[PDB]
Structures are given as structure tokens and as C-alpha cells.
Design a protein around this ligand. Structure first.
Ligand code: ADP
Lengths: 385, 437
């Protein structure tokens, strides 16, 4: 749902209906969960800690549920961020973790984990969905691959990549994920092939080019125990049935589109299954609370020389104000001059970098000059005495 | 500056956090020595180019210029370099690896919103390598994320800098002796600004070279006298600031009207490109035409009279050049725009009155509903003061509206003196002619 007000009314509906059915402990629900305070954040990896007894991954964490808390959530998130840093060379991922970002990672987890699930993610660029999904997939052990558009833009790359994906989620049976975005579409046709992949999963004569039987024959050894026909025998077509079962059970699809432009809406209308099967999630732009949070995360480590109580908090506030404003200036420029202008949180981060760097530079340089103003005071003092 | 500055300072005032009055952004950012060094390297001497050079200097990320004219390409061609195009089979493979493993700086000059995807992951491992790349056609349609990666700078020339550039080029071609005097005194006064800087160095030397026992150095007395001597040459430089700001200025005042006209002409012929594609041309062709016009007819004798002859001849030359490309239905229009863009500066014709001339009944009874639409059109300075009994006399102007060629022989006597003055009386007559007939 697009506007937070729409959210507020559905939660009002929920509270009303909960009171309607729960006509026997209604005051207790009002005290505890119908209250707008945060309640029962459900998660899988935070609640249990590996503890690194003899090996790092000592034991698979309990997986089913977690409780409400924000502190340990962020601490394990930062823990994990350090891990992801040393897993990937040149990760280069200064992800800032604020409350809404934590919730968004939680939602990606909710969809990716589920057997036979997928979720369309919408939001303007810079919302970070493409950045968030990398961690969200690494925690879930899922492999990830993107499509690369060669100098010649064609179709075979898609087919071979999907073949490898199935054979990861089929014969080998590993867990995978797929990260198509607007960069990974060059014409419609890609959308058609993926559409049928969501629906059926059988590519016409990609796997049946005199190969389906050798690959299936490389799998029946698992079938001897998996379906367990008294460890006696099996059949032939039923193996393909189990194969489509496996691949659709472990081929999650993560699509991330733009909300703006021209092509998105009629692309959705072209292919029904796309918006139909997948879950849908919005990412609104960051509100002032998030921005002041980022400002203090970057000013705490940068308040070495800028020491002033009761002015720092107003500083971070005013910096948020500056960002919200350059949004409006962008809008006005496009409105009058019909010339396109955009913005991203990356530029805000770069702006903080410039602030810190040129401030330490000018602080130190001009204060060595002001040290020289004090050397002038020393000259005056020694002359006078 | 304006919008952003008022914007930030109102934020600061509402926030009540303290801030200093006065921007002076360029002054306390870069020492003017490097500014002058760039001005030797072809950086235009005016404000907008100064902030632009700062912006490239900061180099937060690799930049990408909107470049209608080519200031950035020439600047980078000169700034520290003294090249490989995007479209080349060797470029994608060869030029990349050379620059990426030995730092050749790999300039590119043919962005048209179409990116070979291999360009990007190179963008985001020799530690001696940079890269500047720029566009050509104005009004880009860059993707949101192409704004995410690189900084964007607009080098859209303003007319304001344009008249100074044309002023320099006319001072060149009309007689080189003017440039001899110009560059001579200019080098002298630049060096005298550096002599004020040397005075400052002398003060600093006097102040901290000894760093103790300054007073026991009785040579400090000589040092104090030395300070005075340097100020004396500054006084000569001070006198030169007058001798400059009149003499060269009047030598420039003979020509800075011309430059104004030149700039006006250019910003006229820009907009016809938006009227239709294929009416597109550079500044460079215009520069060749301008320099030529000076050569063609400029100098006979009587320099002020030859300034007036500039204003006669240059206009016709550029005018005919553009007409050779124009189409029939656009013939009248280009000349019309030229007239307006001429008068938007000297005569200070209101854009509101221009829109009155472009866009636009109870009182009168004889005239037509097709005509009464026009009465209400004219009705809504003295347009809303003379539709009354003056206009409704109906004595002799009935013949007038009947007469063909209303403007010429049967002139309106509604405002005879206003039509007589003619400084704006033309434009008044024309607002009348359009609204009525
Ligand atoms: N939460 C964040 N904090 C700081 N920078 C971010 C954040 N999210 C995204 N970015 C910046 O935006 C860039 C692109 O992020 P991406 O995941 O592509 O966003 P989107 O998917 O909305 O385009 C990243 O390289 C990163 O520098």
C-alpha cells in the first residue's frame, strides 16, 4: 500500500476485528499487542546464536520464531555485516542499518525463505533493495547469479543460465535465488520465458534435448530413499514429476522494478502471473527520523573537533532538512524547465564524506593559522613584559 | 546561487543555529594563484567558470558534463594533459587495459545516453589512473542511476560571459596594438597583485622568521622601512587600477556594446534549434563569422563611426548566413525574434508586454461579436484607459476600419504623440494592429 495512511486504516481494521472476535480477553490484547508499540518481530537467525564452540557454524540456529527486540537485532546485524565484509572481496557495502531498513531485510527474509515463494519489490532507485537482497540471500545460503548483456544482446545466455539454475536446484538440489532487474531486460521475450518459468518450469526442449533421461538417471539414487517405494523400485515419468517438484521447490525469484517511467504498468498487464503469484512490497522514501539517525551515526565518529552540546542535535536535524529540501528543488526545476534531475542517498553519504574531510582539512589549516594568531598574542605578550 | 542560498539561510534562521552573513564561496576555498594558473590554461575568467573549476577540483566522483559549447573539453585538453573515442573496436579492449594498468587517463567525448555496458563495471586496479568523460548534445536524459554514479556539471554558456569572450576577440582582431597595451598592463598589474602577495610574505617573514629576538635585531628597522617601500609600488599599481579602469574600459566601451549585440544574436540563434531540429550550429562557426566581419569592413578611420558600422554590418552578415538554411514559413519568424532579443536589453521591453503582443462586449455596439472578442481581448498601460468615449466616438475611424492598409495612410490619432515618439511607439502601434485587425 502506497501511503502510510492506508496502512494506518488497515491496522485500525485489524484492531477492531481482533476486539470483535476476542471478546473474552479484549483488555489484555489492548494492553499488550493491540498497542501501537512494537510487538512480536518474527525472525529466524537472530533468536539463536551459533556460539562458535569448536567451529564457527557450530549448530544450525533454531529457525521457527523470534521475539520483539531491537538491540540484539542490530548487534547481530553488525556482526553479520563484518562477516559479509570478509566473505566477499571488495564488498564495498557501507550499509546503514536503521529501523525501516531492518524491517525491509526482515520482509525479504520472509519471502525468500518460504518454500515456493517469490516477491516483487518496487521502489525508486537508491532505496537499496538490490543492496539488501545480497545479505538476505547470503544468510539463507542461497546462491545468486545475475545476467550480463553482452556486446550482442540475444537470448541464449538466458537459456544456459536457467539450465544451470535448475541443475543447481534439481540434480544437485541446492538452494538458489534469481535477481532480475530492469538492467536484466532488453526486450519483452525475456519476460515471457520467465513468466512460464513461474508458471510451469518446463522449458520446451531445453532439458529434453536427449538429456532429461541422463540427468534424471543421475537422481534416482536419491529417489530410492526419498519417496521410499519400500526400497524396491520406481517408474520413469514419475521421476520427472519429482524433478519439477524439486526445482520449483528450490528456485526462488526476486524481481526488482522501477515504479516510474512508462513500461512497468503495461508490462504488468501483459503478463498476469507476474504480479499475481509474487508478493508485493513498497519502499517509501526515507522520512526525517531515518535521516537524522544516519546523520548521528556519521557525526558520532566525526564529532572530534566539532564539540558543542545542544547544537549537535540541531545540526543533524538541519541536515535532514537540507536533504528533504533538495528533493523539492529538483521537483521545481523539472516542473519549470522540463529538464530531468534525480537524487540518491549515495550523494548524501558522499556529502557527509566531503563535510568530514574538508572540515578536518580547513579546521586544522585555518587553526594552525589561528595558532599563528596566538603566536601573535605571544609576540604581543613577550614585547609587553 | 540565489535559490539555493536563500533556501539554506532560511533553513538556518528557522533552525536558529548561528551562521555567518555573506557567502563568498570561492574566496575562502582556493588560493587565487591556482585560479590565475588555470586562467593561463584557458579557464574563462568569469564567476560561473570559477565555481565550475572548483567543482571539478573537489572530484567527489568521476564527472560528466553537459557541454553545449566545449569549455570542459578544451579545459581538460589543456589543464594538465598538455585521447581515445568510445566507438572503436580497439577502445573496448586495448585502451581500457592500458589506462587501467598504467594510467593514461582515457578521455571520452561521445556520450549520447547510450552506454556500452562494459563501460560501467570498469567505473565501479592501477592507483595512478583517473578518467574524465563528457557529453555533447544539451538537455540530457540521463538515467537516475547515471546520476547516482557520477557528478553532473552544466557548462551551458551564459550570455554574460559570452560578451567578455567576444570582447577579447574583437580587441584582438580590430588592432593588435590594443591587445599589446591590454596584455602589457594586465601582466604588469597581475604581477603587482603578486607583489602585494610578496608584501604579505615579507610581513610573515618579519613576524615568524626570527621567532624570538625580533627586537634585538635592529635590522628590523630596515625591515619596517622595507614594508613601506613595497606599499609604494602598490600605490603605483593603485594608480594603474585607475589608468586601467578608464582607458582600457573606454577602449572596451567602444566595443562592449558590440559584444552585447553579438551575445544577443547568439542567444537568438540558439532557440531556433528548438523551433525545429536541423537549425543547429556551433558557436565556432559563429566565431568565424564574427572575426571575419571585423576583417571585412571594420576599419576605415574615425573609430566611433566604425563602431556604428559594426552594428550595421555584423547583424546583416550573421542574418544572411542563417537565412541560407531557413524555410519559407520560418523566414519572417527568425527576423522577428532577432528584433525582440535586441530590444529585451536596451529598450527593456517587458516580457509581460511581449506575451500581451502574442496572446490576449458591453461598451461598443456597432462592431462585431468577432470584434467584441477583440475589444475584451485588448481591454483586460492606457489599453485599459482608452476604450471609452474616446474610442467610442465613431466619428472618422469607421472609414479607418473600412480602409485597407489601416496602418499606413489613415494613421490612428488616438495617441498621436505616443506614435510620434517612436522609442516604443512602434510596439504600441503593433499591439493595436494585432488586437484590432
Ligand atoms: N541504506 C543505504 N545506506 C547508504 N547507501 C545506500 C543505501 N541503500 C543504497 N545505497 C546506495 O545506493 C546504491 C545503489 O543501491 P541499490 O541497492 O541499487 O538501490 P536500488 O535497488 O533502490 O537501486 C548503492 O551502491 C549504495 O551506495
Amino acid at each position: 500500500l502506497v501511503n502510510n495512511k492506508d496502512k494506518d486504516t488497515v491496522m485500525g481494521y485489524i484492531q477492531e476485528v481482533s476486539l470483535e472476535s476476542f471478546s473474552q480477553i479484549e483488555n489484555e490484547i489492548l494492553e499488550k499487542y493491540s498497542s501501537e508499540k512494537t510487538f512480536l518481530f518474527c525472525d529466524f537467525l537472530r533468536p539463536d546464536v551459533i556460539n562458535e564452540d569448536g567451529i564457527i557454524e557450530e549448530e544450525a540456529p533454531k529457525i521457527y520464531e523470534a521475539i520483539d527486540s531491537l538491540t540484539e537485532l542490530r548487534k547481530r546485524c553488525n556482526f553479520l555485516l563484518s562477516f559479509y565484509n570478509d566473505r566477499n572481496p571488495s564488498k564495498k557495502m557501507p550499509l546503514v542499518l536503521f529501523d525501516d531498513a531492518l524491517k525491509h531485510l526482515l520482509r525479504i527474509s520472509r519471502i525468500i525463505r518460504q518454500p515456493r515463494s517469490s516477491g516483487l519489490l518496487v521502489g525508486v532507485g537508491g532505496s537499496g533493495k538490490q543492496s539488501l537482497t545480497r545479505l538476505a540471500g547470503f544468510i539463507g545460503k542461497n546462491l545468486i547469479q545475475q545476467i550480463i548483456v553482452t556486446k550482442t544482446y540475444s537470448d541464449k545466455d538466458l537459456k544456459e543460465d536457467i539450465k544451470k539454475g535448475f541443475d543447481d536446484a534439481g540434480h544437485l538440489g541446492k538452494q538458489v535465488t534469481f535477481l532480475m532487474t530492469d538492467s536484466e531486460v532488453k526486450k519483452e521475450e525475456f519476460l515471457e520465458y520467465i513468466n512460464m518459468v513461474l508458471s510451469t518450469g518446463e522449458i520446451p526442449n531445453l532439458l529434453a534435448k536427449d538429456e532429461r533421461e541422463v540427468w534424471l538417471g543421475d537422481i534416482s539414487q536419491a529417489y530410492c530413499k526419498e519417496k521410499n517405494l519400500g526400497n524396491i523400485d520406481p517408474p520413469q515419468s514419475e521421476l520427472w514429476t519429482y524433478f519439477v517438484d524439486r526445482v520449483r521447490d528450490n528456485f526462488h525469484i526476486m524481481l526488482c522494478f522501477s515504479p516510474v517511467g512508462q513500461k512497468f504498468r503495461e508490462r504488468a498487464r501483459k503478463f498476469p502471473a507476474l504480479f499475481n503469484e509474487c508478493t508485493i512490497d513498497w519502499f517509501l522514501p526515507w522520512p526525517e527520523e531515518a535521516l537524522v539517525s544516519v546523520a548521528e551515526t556519521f557525526i558520532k565518529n566525526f564529532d572530534k573537533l566539532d564539540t558543542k552540546e545542544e547544537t549537535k542535535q540541531e545540526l543533524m536535524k538541519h541536515m535532514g532538512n537540507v536533504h528533504l529540501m533538495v528533493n523539492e528543488i529538483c521537483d521545481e526545476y523539472y516542473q519549470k524547465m522540463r529538464r530531468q534531475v534525480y537524487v540518491t542517498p549515495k550523494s548524501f553519504l558522499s556529502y557527509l564524506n566531503s563535510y568530514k574531510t574538508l572540515y578536518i582539512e580547513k579546521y586544522d589549516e585555518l587553526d594552525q593559522q589561528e595558532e599563528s594568531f596566538k603566536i601573535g598574542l605571544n609576540k604581543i605578550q613577550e614585547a609587553t613584559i | 546561487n540565489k535559490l539555493a542560498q536563500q533556501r539554506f539561510v532560511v533553513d538556518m534562521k528557522k533552525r536558529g543555529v548561528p551562521v555567518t552573513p555573506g557567502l563568498e564561496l570561492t574566496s575562502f576555498l582556493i588560493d587565487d594563484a591556482t585560479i590565475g594558473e588555470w586562467n593561463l590554461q584557458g579557464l574563462p575568467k568569469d564567476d560561473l567558470s570559477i565555481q565550475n573549476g572548483i567543482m571539478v577540483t573537489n572530484s567527489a566522483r568521476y564527472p560528466l558534463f553537459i557541454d553545449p559549447q566545449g569549455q570542459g573539453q578544451n579545459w581538460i585538453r589543456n589543464k594538465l594533459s598538455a585521447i581515445t573515442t568510445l566507438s572503436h573496436p580497439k577502445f573496448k579492449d586495448m585502451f581500457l587495459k592500458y589506462c587501467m594498468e598504467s594510467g593514461l587517463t582515457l578521455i571520452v567525448e561521445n556520450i549520447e545516453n547510450e552506454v556500452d555496458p562494459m563501460m560501467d563495471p570498469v567505473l565501479e586496479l592501477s592507483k595512478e589512473f583517473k578518467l574524465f568523460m563528457t557529453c555533447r548534445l544539451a538537455n540530457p536524459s540521463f538515467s537516475p542511476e547515471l546520476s547516482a554514479k557520477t557528478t553532473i556539471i552544466d557548462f551551458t554558456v551564459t550570455q554574460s560571459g559570452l560578451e567578455q569572450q567576444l570582447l577579447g576577440k574583437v580587441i584582438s582582431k580590430e588592432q593588435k596594438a590594443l591587445e599589446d597595451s591590454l596584455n602589457q598592463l594586465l601582466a604588469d598589474v597581475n604581477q603587482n597583485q603578486k607583489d602585494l602577495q610578496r608584501l604579505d610574505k615579507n610581513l610573515l617573514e618579519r613576524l615568524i622568521n626570527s621567532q624570538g629576538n625580533l627586537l634585538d635585531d635592529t635590522e628590523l628597522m630596515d625591515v619596517l622601512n622595507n614594508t613601506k617601500t613595497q606599499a609604494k609600488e602598490v600605490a603605483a599599481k593603485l594608480i594603474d587600477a585607475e589608468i586601467k579602469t578608464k582607458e582600457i574600459n573606454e577602449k572596451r566601451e567602444q566595443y562592449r556594446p558590440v559584444a552585447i549585440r553579438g551575445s544577443a544574436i547568439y542567444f537568438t540563434m540558439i532557440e531556433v534549434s528548438l523551433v525545429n531540429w536541423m537549425y543547429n550550429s556551433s558557436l565556432e562557426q559563429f566565431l568565424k563569422l564574427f572575426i571575419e566581419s571585423i576583417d571585412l569592413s571594420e576599419k576605415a578611420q574615425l573609430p566611433s563611426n566604425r563602431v556604428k558600422n559594426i552594428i550595421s554590418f555584423l547583424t546583416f552578415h550573421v542574418y544572411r548566413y542563417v537565412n541560407r538554411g531557413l524555410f519559407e514559413k520560418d523566414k519572417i519568424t527568425f527576423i522577428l525574434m532577432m528584433a525582440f532579443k535586441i530590444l529585451t536589453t536596451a529598450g527593456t521591453i517587458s516580457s509581460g508586454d511581449v506575451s500581451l503582443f502574442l496572446k490576449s462586449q458591453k461598451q461598443i455596439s456597432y462592431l462585431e461579436d468577432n470584434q467584441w472578442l477583440n475589444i475584451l481581448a485588448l481591454s483586460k498601460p492606457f489599453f485599459k484607459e482608452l476604450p471609452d468615449l474616446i474610442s467610442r466616438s465613431e466619428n472618422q475611424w469607421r472609414n479607418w476600419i473600412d480602409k485597407n492598409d489601416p496602418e499606413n495612410f489613415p494613421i490612428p490619432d488616438f495617441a498621436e504623440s505616443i506614435n510620434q515618439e517612436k522609442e516604443i511607439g512602434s510596439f504600441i502601434s503593433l499591439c493595436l494592429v494585432r488586437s484590432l485587425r
